[PDB]
């Protein structure tokens, strides 16, 4: 399961569902991930609304904000819920980027998400049943 295309497909979905357009077996993981995400965003929508209004994205601080939030998110543990939030947070930042016309920032966020998946979350995912475990937990 390629972590990059997991990111790419997810970000593209979340954006196109908000009205933006973006130049981007195994398909089950992608479908399950974005379904869990839409459910996550819906339930805590007011919260995500308050979070997006405090992001305060600038081209200078962007990568710092991503690094900081993500680090504190997994600072004291990793579970599938937090991994979903990690994708959803990435989505929030990508949406707030095109909201201010910083399209190139989306590609960078996509890069950062991918880099974080390979470097940190990957070992956890493998040692916790792989993505198949996630599908069994967030599917039917």
């Amino acid at each position: 399961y390629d972590n990059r295309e997991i990111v790419m497909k997810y970000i593209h979905y979340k954006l196109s569902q908000r009205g933006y357009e973006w130049d981007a077996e195994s398909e089950v993981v992608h479908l399950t991930l974005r379904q869990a995400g839409d459910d996550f965003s819906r339930r805590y929508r007011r919260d995500f609304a308050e979070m997006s209004s405090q992001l305060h994205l600038t081209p200078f601080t962007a990568r710092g904000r991503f690094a900081t939030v993500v680090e504190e998110l997994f600072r004291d543990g990793v579970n599938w819920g937090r991994i979903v939030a990690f994708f959803e947070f990435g989505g929030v930042m990508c949406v707030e980027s095109v909201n201010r016309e910083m399209s190139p920032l989306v590609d960078n966020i996509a890069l950062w998400m991918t880099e974080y998946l390979n470097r940190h979350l990957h070992t956890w995912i493998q040692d916790n049943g792989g993505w198949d475990a996630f599908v069994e937990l967030y599917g039917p």
Binding site: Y44, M51, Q54, L73, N79, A85, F89, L137
Partner: peptide, 19 residues
């Protein structure tokens, strides 16, 4: 008001519903 704190909190509520 803190972003990662709230995100982490609701993430765990979401996860506890799946056990």
């Amino acid at each position: 008001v803190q972003i990662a704190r709230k995100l982490q909190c609701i993430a765990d509520q979401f996860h506890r519903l799946h056990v």
